[PDB]
Amino acid sequence: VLRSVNSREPSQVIFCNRSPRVVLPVWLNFDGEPQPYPTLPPGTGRRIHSYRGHLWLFRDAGTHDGLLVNQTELFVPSLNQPIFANITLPVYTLKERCLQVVRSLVKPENYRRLDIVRSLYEDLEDHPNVQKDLERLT
């Protein structure tokens, strides 16, 4: 339902990591399967060969936290010369930001040892996932 179009029309793109995270570029293949591409260190860029109508999303490489590309969730290369893909942090909610910090400090096996409400333990275990973000997205 969310898949790349097999246009076969080349499109040069600059993946510009304007975030403090290690970025995981994810291509949605012709069947809609997420395909990971080499990671981008913070502050760096890459000149990549893509195609018109192809679908990309960007995540934090270690945690899968969602990132923005040109202020939206999805990037679609258009007609060229190179298209800029400006990858940035979203303004996360305070709750999501706290969950990210707690997940970075506590091993998942130990979430149940934290003195918090059961509903927060469930929020901690409900890690960001590309599959969950894709379904849906309608």
């Binding site: 403090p20 942090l89 303004v91 305070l94 709750k95 707690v102 918090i116 409400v117 509903s119």
Partner: protein, 87 residues
């Protein structure tokens, strides 16, 4: 114009009314001008107020957005406050 948010330990935080209405819980508590937080200590509530300013500044902005910092020592309590305030 401004509203007063009082922490469990009695610290008074004066913030723009619009910045405070960023929280649905606060809007409900307001509808003084003053809100008392029995369970929210000052080291947590000061960070909540910094979040409001950060959110109002960086929302619908094309500028590079910096990370919102949270010291490990405040993380658990801030998570409980953010959960209650729907922040």
């Amino acid at each position: 114009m401004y509203v007063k948010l009082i922490s469990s330990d009695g610290h008074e935080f004066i913030v723009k009314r619009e910045h405070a209405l960023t929280s649905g819980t606060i809007k409900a508590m307001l509808s003084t001008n003053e809100v008392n937080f029995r369970e929210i200590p000052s080291h947590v509530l000061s960070k909540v107020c910094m979040y409001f300013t950060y959110k109002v500044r960086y929302t619908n902005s094309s500028t590079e957005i910096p990370e919102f910092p949270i010291a490990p020592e405040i993380a658990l309590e801030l998570l409980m406050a953010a959960n209650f305030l729907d922040c």
